[PDB]
Design a protein around this ligand. Structure first.
Ligand SMILES: OC[C@H]1O[C@@H](O)[C@@H](O)[C@@H](O)[C@@H]1O
Ligand SMILES: OC[C@H]1O[C@H](O)[C@@H](O)[C@@H](O)[C@@H]1O
Ligand SMILES: [Ca+2]
Ligand SMILES: [Ca+2]
Ligand SMILES: [Cl-]
Ligand code: NA
Ligand code: NA
Length: 258
């Protein structure tokens, strides 16, 4: 045939072609989350959108290194140093530091998350931007682990609306990766999700992440169509655009036929 037939049953992921000035990296918004609240983040509506009904603490833009690896302090005999969780032991010490005099269960303030001074022990944050595939094909996004709760969403009308990156969150719960902390706190069923993408279109991307206490972890990766993996540093793949609600042609409801 002259033209491709298109993905079946309108199944292509919606993408975007924003016409404005592209910015490298994602925007990170931070919102209040209560220390040791082990229920709010179990919820889908909260992780999709309800987080933004909490106080907004601040934001930072232009972030290309997006994994989280927050370690609480150990107030040790030799000073205060961050403790990798796997090195913690007893009640409690940190291997190579001896016993720690401080509590695991209080809030701690740090710039570890994106340079923004907040409480990484207890916070929710929303990463938004557009993923630019260099290759047409299947992309597999993954979280290596999740501590405490996270989702990843890809696509127009799923992550956010085309050319409307800065708007309040949309209500879609059609997550690409559902990493929500289960009520009965095992691991989530699946912390990887696949999207078929067409090169050169901008795909809305949203990550929402919550920590309730102590350590926080979210190692983010994507496997490209060519089989290579990009981990943590997404420079060259993620971008931001200021809203332009007036750009009529911004949404591409089916890239395969566009
Ligand atoms: O923790 C989130 C991000 O914080 C930034 O300031 C850098 O340290 C990144 O390497 C890290 O991925
Ligand atoms: O699961 C509740 C909790 O368990 C541990 O205390 C640590 O792994 C925390 O980071 C985690 O939030
Ligand atoms: Ca829409
Ligand atoms: Ca935690
Ligand atoms: Cl030790
Ligand atoms: Na860690
Ligand atoms: Na520290």
């Amino acid at each position: 045939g002259l033209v491709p037939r298109g993905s079946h049953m309108s199944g292509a992921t919606e993408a975007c072609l924003p016409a404005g000035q592209r910015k490298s990296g994602m925007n990170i918004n931070f919102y209040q989350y209560s220390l040791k609240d082990s229920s709010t983040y179990s919820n889908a509506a909260y992780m999709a959108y309800g987080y933004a009904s909490k106080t907004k603490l601040g934001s930072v833009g232009g972030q290309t290194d997006i994994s989280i690896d927050y370690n609480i302090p150990c107030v040790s005999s030799s000073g205060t140093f961050p403790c990798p969780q796997e090195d913690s032991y007893g009640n409690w010490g940190c291997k190579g530091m001896g016993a720690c005099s401080n509590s695991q269960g209080i809030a701690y303030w740090s710039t570890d998350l994106f340079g923004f001074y907040t409480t990484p022990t207890n916070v929710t944050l929303e990463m938004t931007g557009y993923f630019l595939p260099p290759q047409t094909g299947s992309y597999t996004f993954s979280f290596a682990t999740v501590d405490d709760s996270a989702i990843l969403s890809v696509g127009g009308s799923i992550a956010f609306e085309c050319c409307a990156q800065e708007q309040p969150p949309i209500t879609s719960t059609n997550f690409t990766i559902n990493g929500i902390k289960p009520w009965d706190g095992s691991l989530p069923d699946n912390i990887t999700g696949t999207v078929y993408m067409y090169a050169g279109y901008y795909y809305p991307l949203k990550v929402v992440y919550s920590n309730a206490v102590s350590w926080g972890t979210l190692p983010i990766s994507v496997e490209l169509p060519d089989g290579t993996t990009v981990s943590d540093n997404f420079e060259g793949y993620v971008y931001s655009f200021d809203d332009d609600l007036s750009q009529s042609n911004c949404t591409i409801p089916d890239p395969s036929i566009h």
